[PDB]
Structure 1
Amino acid sequence: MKKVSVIMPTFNNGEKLHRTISSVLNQTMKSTDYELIIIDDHSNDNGETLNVIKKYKGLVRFKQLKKNSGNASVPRNTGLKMSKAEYVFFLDSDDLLHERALEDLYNYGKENNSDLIIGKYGVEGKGRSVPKAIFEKGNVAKADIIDNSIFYALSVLKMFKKSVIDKNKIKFKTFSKTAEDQLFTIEFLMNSKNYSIKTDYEYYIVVNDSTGNQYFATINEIYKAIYKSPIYKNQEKRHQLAGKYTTRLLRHGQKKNFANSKMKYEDKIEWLNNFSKTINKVPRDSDKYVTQIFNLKLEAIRQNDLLAVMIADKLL
């Protein structure tokens, strides 16, 4: 039984994949103590990606899907079924690991009985930004969701204890193109207690290179996960978590500024209708735990009032 399975889905990556794979194979951890599982989501780049992967035959486990799934959910789920390790680490195909990522994160995790270990993120290039606040207090052995800003770092680019995933049958959902990674991390967080944060190096480097029916279905699942948490059983604690997630959603959500956008009016109405329907399944008791700058925007969404959301956005 290996310490870590690195699970990496690929799709039409080409010669860029060399850098990523190399970063995983060049770890300070004993090479026999981890594996790299590569799951190609049926690349169609005239065999360029598959040719790069073939160069590491013998040194990595590999499966190719018959049809392209469209996102990383099915590939990652396939990797999870293939792993029998203590921890898994999800890695995106364009990104890089620091030489001492698996060793340092696994050691910290093992020494603190961690269900989840989060390594400090770095970033190369303009594009997506990475979480910063979670890492501002240095290393944290027993982190807290609220006090350590974990709802602002819900990517799956972390080390997860496989037993938690297995015991609770946590899979990536495929009903949406976005926020499926958030739902996964939330499901995990709500079914575990021990989270640790390690910040000695930039362990993971992120490399930068419609009506909302499906999106808000996923957001709904996130709130459901919080309110059904067997770890956070206290209803007031659930309200606090839900409120904090609402804050993150209003700060960093998809199409956060839809109301004053160039979007067609009928589309705005349908979008807000889905956002309203979803947030109105969340107890109002959570609202008091939302950052108060968003008090008006949140009420506007609850009331399903487009004008009020437009105004709220103008005042933010």
Structure 2
Amino acid sequence: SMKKVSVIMPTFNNGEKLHRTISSVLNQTMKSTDYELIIIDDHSNDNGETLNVIKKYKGLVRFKQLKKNSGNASVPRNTGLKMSKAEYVFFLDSDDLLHERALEDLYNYGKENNSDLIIGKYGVEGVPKAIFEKGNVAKADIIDNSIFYALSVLKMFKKSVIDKNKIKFKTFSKTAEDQLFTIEFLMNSKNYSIKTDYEYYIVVNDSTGNQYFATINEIYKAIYKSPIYKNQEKRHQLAGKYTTRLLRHGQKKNFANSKMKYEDKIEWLNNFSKTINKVPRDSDKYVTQIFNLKLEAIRQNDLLAVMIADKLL
């Protein structure tokens, strides 16, 4: 009997707080025997506090401790993926909470719709919006349902897609690697669903650009190599819409007139410029028109022009 869902949760120095997160997972409307919680501790060093909490649920979770701290969720999440033989996986960050109906509602909706990906609406304690404005969507589309604006991995993923395509979290970047996983997944599957009956996942709140733009480069390459979105114009459309999201919400989007040092601005822009210049210009017509000059200035690797563009926005 293959499990319906593996919840994959990295921990690091969470301490007593973790009780509430683990409890939200163990308290599900889904039958306890139909799912599992996989905890991967990224070598906590908080005088055993995190491990003491995990040990209180010994027998109710699967657990692996890493021997050295990796520094972020990527290696721990990859470890979880190797351990899961479930139908779907769900990534849960150690500080957050699941609604008690999250696994049952998202899995059932997935099964009903043969979904590769099921996105439950996010709540916040103390998050994306447009994707959830249309109610439940059985067969969502990346552009029409604003999925480029909600690329966290805090979602339910069909494990066969991940295994067949060898999708792993990259360990070369401490930013945007989550975006990349979700994009690789989307580019290798067709059926996406959006479930909004409850706030199913609660988010609890508390550089050169080399690695960042390397990650961005991998996003565009995933679009342009997609076995699902094979048509070259659809690839241009997807790429141009991603470019738009990047210019709206990207890191240091307004770096050019910022207090960043000149030599850092030049390195940042060199990275951005060489990244976007590997993207066909055929994608540019799908970028929102207000960004025409800023995008061209970035292609031209011209800091003065980006400065000017930003002043005219």
What TM-score do you get using the length of structure 2 for normalisation? 0.99
Residue 86 of structure 1 and its aligned partner are, at CA, apart by 0.1
Residue 99 of structure 1 and its aligned partner are, at CA, apart by 0.5
- SS for the counterpart of 2:167 is coil
1:155-178: CA deviation from partner (whole Å, max 9, x where unpaired): 000000000000111000111001
The equivalent position to 1:247 in structure 2, one of 244, 256, 262, is 244
How far apart are the structure 2 equivalents of 1:97 and 1:307?
A: 47
- SS for the counterpart of 2:8 is strand
- SS for the counterpart of 2:193 is strand
Residue 315 of structure 1 and its aligned partner are, at CA, apart by 2.1
How far apart are the structure 1 equivalents of 2:64 and 2:174?
A: 22
| Structure 1 residue runs without a partner (length 5+) | none
Counterpart residue number, 1:235 = 232
Counterparts of 1:4-15 in structure 2, within 5 Å, are 4-15=5-16
1:66-112: CA deviation from partner (whole Å, max 9, x where unpaired): 11001100000000000000000000000100010000000000000
How far apart are the structure 2 equivalents of 1:58 and 1:314?
A: 59
| Structure 2 residue runs without a partner (length 5+) | none
Identity %: 100
Residue 249 of structure 1 and its aligned partner are, at CA, apart by 0.8
1:205-263: CA deviation from partner (whole Å, max 9, x where unpaired): 11101011111111100000000000000000000000011111111111111111111
Counterpart residue number, 2:143 = 146
1:130-189: CA deviation from partner (whole Å, max 9, x where unpaired): 100000000000000000000101000000000000011100011100111110000000
- SS for the counterpart of 1:147 is coil
The equivalent position to 1:295 in structure 2, one of 292, 295, 301, is 292
Counterpart residue number, 2:162 = 165
What TM-score do you get using the length of structure 1 for normalisation? 0.98
- SS for the counterpart of 2:119 is strand
How far apart are the structure 2 equivalents of 1:262 and 1:190?
A: 37
Count of residue pairs the alignment pairs up:
312
How far apart are the structure 1 equivalents of 2:300 and 2:13?
A: 44
Residue 44 of structure 1 and its aligned partner are, at CA, apart by 1.2
How far apart are the structure 2 equivalents of 1:283 and 1:44?
A: 47
Say what the alpha-carbon RMSD is for the aligned residues.
Answer: 0.9
Higher deviation after alignment, 2-11 or 254-263? 254-263
1:271-301: CA deviation from partner (whole Å, max 9, x where unpaired): 0000000000000000001111111111111
How far apart are the structure 2 equivalents of 1:150 and 1:49?
A: 34
